[PDB]
Amino acid sequence: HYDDELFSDVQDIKTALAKIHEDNQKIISKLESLLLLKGEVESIKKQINRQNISIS
Amino acid sequence: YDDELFSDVQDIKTALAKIHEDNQKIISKLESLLLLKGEVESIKKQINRQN
Amino acid sequence: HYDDELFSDVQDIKTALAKIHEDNQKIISKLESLLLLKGEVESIKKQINRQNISI
Amino acid sequence: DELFSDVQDIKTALAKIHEDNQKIISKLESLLLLKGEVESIKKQINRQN
């Protein structure tokens, strides 16, 4: 059959998987947030290149 | 193979599959983020020349 | 009922999930630490625009 | 029998996830080094001012 302790173990696996999934959704959105650094860093690089055009 | 156990196992399978795919998405986003190292290194270099 | 070897397999599965959960917590805090880069990068941008008004 | 096969596939999937996790942590540790670097850049921008 479906033994009670096996059942219990399965429930805890369910809980843990569910925690893992939601943590992954946090991970992903933090990453989406961090990826915005690429353009910003690119802008700094661009500004530093206009700045280095300082024939003074 | 109890039907309910069976159902539970399939649900675990779905969750694992989803987790795995999220992992590949995370890795790729990370591979992209890693390109920042060279860019930041480059800015540092430009800033030192600028000095 | 709950067969000995299935039982052994379930415990190993439990061990792996625990480890995975843990690595996730460490991953999350590393990410929270990296997110501070946003403000810092923003400051740099600002202090460089300030510099550009060098004329 | 079929449950056995399912458990093996779960074990496979778990191992893969775990290993991606080690690759993720390592990429992250490398990314963490960016903290000192932009701190330096920040410092050299202040000195430039």
UniProtKB/Swiss-Prot annotation, chain A:
- What is known about its processing and modification? Phosphorylation on serines by host CK2 is necessary for the formation of viral factories.
User: Where is region (Multimerization) located?
Assistant: 1-56
Q: Please state what the annotation says regarding this protein's domains.
A: The N-terminus consists of a long intrinsically disordered tail. The central part contains the coiled-coil multimerization domain (MD). Forms a four-stranded coiled coil structure. The C-terminus constitutes the alpha-helical domain (XD) that binds to the nucleocapsid (N-RNA complex).
Summarize subunit and interaction data from the UniProt record for this chain.
Answer: Homotetramer. Interacts (via multimerization domain and XD domain) with polymerase L; this interaction forms the polymerase L-P complex. Interacts (via N-terminus) with N0 (via Ncore); this interaction allows P to chaperon N0 to avoid N polymerization and non-specific RNA binding before encapsidation. Interacts (via C-terminus) with N-RNA template (via Ntail); this interaction maintains the P/L complex anchored to the nucleocapsid template during the sequential transcription. Interacts (via C-terminus) with protein C this interaction allows C to associate with the ribonucleocapsid.
Q: Which family does it belong to?
A: Belongs to the morbillivirus P protein family.
Q: What does this protein do?
A: Essential cofactor of the RNA polymerase L that plays a central role in the transcription and replication by forming the polymerase complex with RNA polymerase L and recruiting L to the genomic N-RNA template for RNA synthesis. Also plays a central role in the encapsidation of nascent RNA chains by forming the encapsidation complex with the nucleocapsid protein N (N-P complex). Acts as a chaperone for newly synthesized free N protein, so-called N0, allowing encapsidation of nascent RNA chains during replication.
From the Swiss-Prot or TrEMBL record, give the protein name: Phosphoprotein
Q: Give the species this sequence originates from.
A: Measles virus (strain Edmonston-AIK-C vaccine)
Name the gene that codes for it. Answer: P/V
Q: Which residues of the full protein are shown?
A: 306 to 361 of 507
From Swiss-Prot, chain B:
Source organism superkingdom? Viruses
PTM annotation? Phosphorylation on serines by host CK2 is necessary for the formation of viral factories.
Q: What is the lineage of its organism?
A: Viruses, Riboviria, Orthornavirae, Negarnaviricota, Haploviricotina
Instruction: Give me the disulphide-bonded residues.
Output: none
Q: Which gene name belongs to this protein? A: P/V
Q: How does it assemble?
A: Homotetramer. Interacts (via multimerization domain and XD domain) with polymerase L; this interaction forms the polymerase L-P complex. Interacts (via N-terminus) with N0 (via Ncore); this interaction allows P to chaperon N0 to avoid N polymerization and non-specific RNA binding before encapsidation. Interacts (via C-terminus) with N-RNA template (via Ntail); this interaction maintains the P/L complex anchored to the nucleocapsid template during the sequential transcription. Interacts (via C-terminus) with protein C this interaction allows C to associate with the ribonucleocapsid.
Q: What is this protein called?
A: Phosphoprotein
Q: Know anything about its domains from the record?
A: The N-terminus consists of a long intrinsically disordered tail. The central part contains the coiled-coil multimerization domain (MD). Forms a four-stranded coiled coil structure. The C-terminus constitutes the alpha-helical domain (XD) that binds to the nucleocapsid (N-RNA complex).
Q: What does this protein do?
A: Essential cofactor of the RNA polymerase L that plays a central role in the transcription and replication by forming the polymerase complex with RNA polymerase L and recruiting L to the genomic N-RNA template for RNA synthesis. Also plays a central role in the encapsidation of nascent RNA chains by forming the encapsidation complex with the nucleocapsid protein N (N-P complex). Acts as a chaperone for newly synthesized free N protein, so-called N0, allowing encapsidation of nascent RNA chains during replication.
Parent sequence residues shown: 307 to 357 of 507
UniProt region (Multimerization), positions on chain: 1-51
Tell me the organism. Measles virus (strain Edmonston-AIK-C vaccine) (MeV)
Q: Which family does it belong to?
A: Belongs to the morbillivirus P protein family.
